[PDB]
């Protein structure tokens, strides 16, 4: 019931493992906070006093299995240093995945030039997850019935033009129509000597509250098969 993040990162592989964990937890927490899967499709682990919810793979909850297997293609592109961005998108009409209600962007950069310079990797990891909570606890609800789709983007100068992660085909339309007025939340970054991981959220204006001191809160691209 405990999830332990590497405090110190010394090898590229430690770093690669951390990013996969970071990607999984974030996708899991985000989908849990926005109620995209019911409570019973998540297990609970702890992150030094922080309640975290991990998506489970089970036939009992539909679509949960497909997202977990989608991550498999994300991990593959990640190890091979091909992956640039993961876009997880929420849409309502099961026939127009291009018209979306909300999405989440996960950006990756590969480096050897030490961590990020700002103006301990476990503190940063716990700050990123805590920020996802603070910045998405109070977002207005999504529509009642929603669908999930995923888009991968690569560093094309190192990626074989015919490469496909497991479960992914080459993509159709790179852009999407955002219903309403989109707001861009930059949640945060986490860096290691070898990787940078960023999280950005795009939500509709009416889902924001701007409740202040009140009583309420004082190019290659891939798609899935």
Does residue 169 belong to any structural domain of this protein?
Answer: yes
The SS3 call for residue 72 is: helix
Distances in Å between the alpha carbon of 184 and those of 98, 125, 201, 202? 19, 21, 6, 5
What is the DSSP annotation of 79-146? HTT-EEEEEEEEES-TT-TTEEEEEEEEEEEE-SS-S-----HHHHHHHHHHHHHHHHSSPPPPPSS-
Domain with residue 49: its CATH number is 3.30.900.10
Alpha-carbon 52 to chain mean position? 14
Four-point Cα dihedral 140, 143, 144, 148, nearest 10: -110
Does residue 85 belong to any structural domain of this protein?
Answer: yes
Domain hosting 204: range is 12-224
Q: What is the sign, positive or negative, of the torsion defined by CA atoms of 14, 20, 22, 24?
A: negative
Angle (deg, nearest 10), helices 12-33 and 121-136: 20
What kind of experiment solved this structure? X-ray
Does residue 194 belong to any structural domain of this protein?
Answer: yes
Nearest to 201 by CA among 24, 3, 27: 27
DSSP 8-state code for residue 74? H
Does residue 2 belong to any structural domain of this protein?
Answer: no
Tokens of 122: 């476990």
Mark the breaks in the chain: residue after which each occurs, C to N over 2.5 Å: 119, 218
The SS3 call for residue 38 is: coil
What gap in Å lies between CA 138 and CA 46, rounded to an integer?
Answer: 22
Cα radius of gyration rounded to whole Å, the chain: 17
**Where do we find the tokens 């790179």?**
174
Does residue 17 belong to any structural domain of this protein?
Answer: yes
**Where do we find the tokens 């019935």?**
145
Domain total in the chain? 1
How many CA atoms lie less than 13 Å away from 195 in the CB half-sphere? Answer: 30
Nearest to 149 by CA among 49, 221, 219: 221
What gap in Å lies between CA 79 and CA 117, rounded to an integer?
Answer: 24
Angle (deg, nearest 10), helices 12-33 and 64-79: 150
At how many Å resolution was this determined?
A: 2.7
Please check whether residue 104 is in contact with residue 87, taking contact to mean a CB–CB distance below 8 angstroms. Answer: yes
What is the DSSP annotation of 7-33? SS--SHHHHHHHHHHHHHHHHHHHHHH
Bridge partners, 150 (sequence order): 88
Nearest to 196 by CA among 84, 45, 59, 42: 84
Distances in Å between the alpha carbon of 37 and those of 85, 96, 113, 192, 199? 23, 21, 39, 31, 20
Does residue 4 belong to any structural domain of this protein?
Answer: no
Does residue 7 belong to any structural domain of this protein?
Answer: no
Please check whether residue 117 is in contact with residue 196, taking contact to mean a CB–CB distance below 8 angstroms. Answer: no
Does residue 3 belong to any structural domain of this protein?
Answer: no
């Amino acid at each position: 019931s405990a999830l332990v993040f590497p405090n110190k990162i010394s090898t590229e592989h430690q770093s690669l493992v951390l990013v996969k964990r970071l990607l999984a937890v974030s996708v899991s927490c985000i989908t849990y906070l926005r109620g995209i899967f019911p409570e019973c499709a998540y297990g609970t682990r702890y992150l030094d006093d922080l309640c975290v919810k991990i998506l489970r793979e089970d036939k009992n909850c539909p679509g949960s299995t497909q997202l977990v297997k989608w991550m498999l293609g994300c991990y593959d592109a990640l190890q091979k240093k091909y992956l640039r961005m993961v876009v997880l998108a929420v849409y309502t009409n099961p026939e127009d995945p291009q018209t979306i209600s909300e999405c989440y962007q996960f950006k990756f950069k590969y480096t050897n030039n030490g961590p990020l310079m700002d103006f301990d990797t476990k503190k940063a990891s716990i700050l990123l997850i805590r920020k996802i909570y603070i910045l998405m606890q109070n977002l207005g609800p999504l529509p009642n019935d929603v669908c999930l789709t995923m888009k991968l983007f690569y560093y094309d100068e190192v990626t074989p033009p015919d490469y496909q992660p497991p479960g992914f085909k080459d993509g159709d339309c790179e852009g999407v129509i955002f219903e309403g007025e989109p707001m861009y939340l930059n949640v945060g970054e986490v860096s290691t000597p070898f990787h940078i991981f960023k999280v950005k959220v795009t939500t509709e204006r009416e889902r924001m509250e701007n409740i202040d001191s009140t009583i309420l809160s004082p190019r290659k691209f891939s798609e899935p098969k």
